[PDB]
Structures are given as C-alpha cells and as structure tokens.
Amino acid sequence: STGSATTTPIDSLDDAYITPVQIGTPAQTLNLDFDTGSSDLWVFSSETTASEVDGQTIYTPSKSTTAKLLSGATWSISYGDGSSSSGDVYTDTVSVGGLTVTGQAVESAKKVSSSFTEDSTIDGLLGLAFSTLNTVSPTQQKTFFDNAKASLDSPVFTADLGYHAPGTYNFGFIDTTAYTGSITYTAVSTKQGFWEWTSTGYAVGSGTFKSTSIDGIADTGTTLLYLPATVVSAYWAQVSGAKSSSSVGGYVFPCSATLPSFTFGVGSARIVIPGDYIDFGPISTGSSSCFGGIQSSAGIGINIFGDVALKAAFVVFNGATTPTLGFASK
Numbered sequence: 001s002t003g004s005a006t007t008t009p010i011d012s013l014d015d016a017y018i019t020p021v022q023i024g025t026p027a028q029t030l031n032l033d034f035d036t037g038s039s040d041l042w043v044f045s046s047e048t049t050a051s052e053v054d055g056q057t058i059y060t061p062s063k064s065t066t067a068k069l070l071s072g073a074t075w076s077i078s079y080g081d082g083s084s085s086s087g088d089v090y091t092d093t094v095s096v097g098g099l100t101v102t103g104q105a106v107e108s109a110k111k112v113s114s115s116f117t118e119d120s121t122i123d124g125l126l127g128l129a130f131s132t133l134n135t136v137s138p139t140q141q142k143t144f145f146d147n148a149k150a151s152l153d154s155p156v157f158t159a160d161l162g163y164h165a166p167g168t169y170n171f172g173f174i175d176t177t178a179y180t181g182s183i184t185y186t187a188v189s190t191k192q193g194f195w196e197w198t199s200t201g202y203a204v205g206s207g208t209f210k211s212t213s214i215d216g217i218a219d220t221g222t223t224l225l226y227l228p229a230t231v232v233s234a235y236w237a238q239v240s241g242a243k244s245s246s247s248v249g250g251y252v253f254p255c256s257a258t259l260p261s262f263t264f265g266v267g268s269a270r271i272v273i274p275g276d277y278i279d280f281g282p283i284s285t286g287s288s289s290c291f292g293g294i295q296s297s298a299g300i301g302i303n304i305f306g307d308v309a310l311k312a313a314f315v316v317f318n319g320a321t322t323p324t325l326g327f328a329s330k
C-alpha cells in the first residue's frame with residue numbers, strides 16, 4: 001500500500017504545516033501537524049476542556065462506530081517549546097492520503113496548553129519519530145508509520161515541505177519526480193528516539209564550506225533551524241545589523257536586509273537553504289526588526305533540523321530494519 005497527502009503552511013511564515021487526516025467511521029477529518037520529532041497522535045476532542053478549545057475541529061469518538069476506548073490508558077506530553085497536552089486514548093481507524101491503519105491509538109486531549117488553544121489551525125499532532133518516545137501509559141502505543149510499515153510497498157515516508165506553498169507527505173514510496181539529482185542517504189541513531197543524524201558541515205552564502213560534524217534531528221514539527229552557537233554566529237555575522245536579542249529570544253535582523261543562503265552537508269552532498277527561507281518577519285506587527293530562521297541550539301541540548309532546513313530538501317525517512325535518512329535537492 002501507499003499514501004499521499006498534501007501538507008499546507010498554517011500561515012504566511014510557514015510556522016507549521018497541517019495535513020488532513022481521516023479518523024473514525026464515518027470519517028472525521030482533522031488537520032494535524034505531522035511531527036517527526038515526537039511519537040504521539042493526539043487530537044482536540046469532545047473531551048477537551050471547553051475553555052481550551054478555540055476554533056479547532058474536534059474528534060468525537062462517540063460518533064465513530066469503530067472507536068474503542070483503550071481501557072486505563074492515559075497520555076501526557078510536553079514539547080520543546082514548553083507547550084503540553086494530555087488525556088485518554090481510543091483506538092480507531094486512521095487514514096492519511098489513502099493509506100489506512102486500523103486500531104491506531106488516537107490520543108484524545110482532555111487538556112491542552114495555551115499555545116495549542118491559541119492556534120485555531122492545528123487540530124492535533126501526528127507523531128512520526130520512533131515509537132519508543134510514545135507517552136501512552138501503562139501500555140506504550142505505536143505511531144501511524146510504525147503501524148502502517150509492514151503493509152507499505154516500501155517501509156518509508158517522505159517529507160516534501162513547500163516554501164510559502166503546499167507540499168507533500170508520501171508513505172510507502174519515493175516519488176522520483178519530486179527532486180533533482182540523487183538522494184544522499186546518511187546514518188541514523190535511534191538511541192534517543194529521534195531521526196538523529198550527523199551533518200558533515202556548513203557554508204554561509206558563497207563562503208567556503210566548513211567540514212564539521214553536526215549531530216541533530218530531522219524534525220518537521222519544529223519551525224526553525226537550531227544549530228551550535230559558533231555556526232549561528234558565523235551566519236548572522238554576514239548580515240549587517242543582525243544581533244542576538246535576549247529580550248526577543250534570539251537573533252533578529254533589520255527587515256531591510258538581504259539574507260545570505262545557508263548550506264548544510266549530507267555526506268558529500270550539499271543542501272542549500274535560500275536566504276529568504278531564513279526570514280520570519282517582524283518580531284511584532286509593524287516592527288522593522290525581523291526574527292531569524294537560524295537560531296542557537298545552546299539552551300536546547302540538541303541541534304534541530306526543523307522546517308527551515310527540511311523544506312529546502314526532499315527528505316526520505318527510511319524505516320528499514322536499520323533506519324536511514326535521505327536528502328535530495330529539489
């Protein structure tokens with residue numbers, strides 16, 4: 001089997017991407033944030049504290065003839081940005097772009113933090129990291145991909161995020177028309193439950209490539225590119241007036257600036273992030289200070305190849321017995 005679904009930026013900045021997902025019978029379609037950095041499929045629901053729902057589409061398990069309460073199961077997750085959610089668990093039928101999984105754990109939110117409430121465009125998350133990170137207790141549950149894998153033509157999914165444009169998540173096949181040149185594959189460590197890999201280095205604009213190992217995770221659920229302070233300083237040094245602002249919470253730059261590209265290495269291959277991908281707009285409405293798309297990972301504990309990096313590439317998440325990651329230009 002295969003699946004193919006369009007993923008769409010939630011706003012003009014590509015802050016996140018949502019993908020339609022069919023849950024239950026008859027289908028209830030929710031727009032989920034596909035997150036290769038987490039492993040829970042959770043949704044706004046009929047059970048979510050009413051005051052914490054503001055415009056989201058909700059899953060109503062009582063209206064699904066295939067919904068079954070997973071007795072005694074609870075979940076609770078907190079993400080890297082300080083947001084959180086929790087609730088109970090159903091199993092139900094879940095389909096993404098024509099690919100169907102029966103008995104998928106659908107985690108129903110009873111509580112969500114303010115940042116989820118305040119974002120009307122995201123109805124929940126669909127985790128695509130390794131199932132070892134799943135927070136369901138006392139019986140850990142598998143991700144959608146983990147459940148689908150054996151049925152897929154090939155045990156892979158691909159992320160093809162657009163810049164200011166829709167893109168595609170494919171399951172079970174590699175669309176050879178969706179990228180240029182070749183796909184370069186690179187080793188993955190699953191030790192921390194992430195799609196963790198090691199970049200071979202970087203360049204800033206037309207500058208010389210610096211060969212240096214950068215361990216990080218491929219995370220579709222993170223907006224920005226988070227890299228070591230040395231690398232990030234080298235980047236913003238090429239932008240007149242750019243500086244790190246403690247009050248804003250990262251590097252900012254004059255909105256009048258022309259940003260240089262950023263290149264990262266995948267083995268001997270190179271992925272080039274165009275400068276305008278790195279512009280995340282005025283720090284507040286009307287401001288002439290803009291927020292940078294490359295930020296320091298220093299206070300995180302891990303480097304994160306988020307959407308800013310990933311949307312410059314066609315990315316293969318290879319879920320073979322020994323998982324690997326593939327990157328191609330496009």
Ligand SMILES: N[C@H]1[C@H](O)[C@H](O)C[C@@H]1C1CCCCC1
Binds near residue numbers: 280
């Ligand atoms: N909505 C945020 C995304 O998640 C990125 O982290 C940056 C963006 C925003 C830009 C304006 C300054 C504050 C941060």
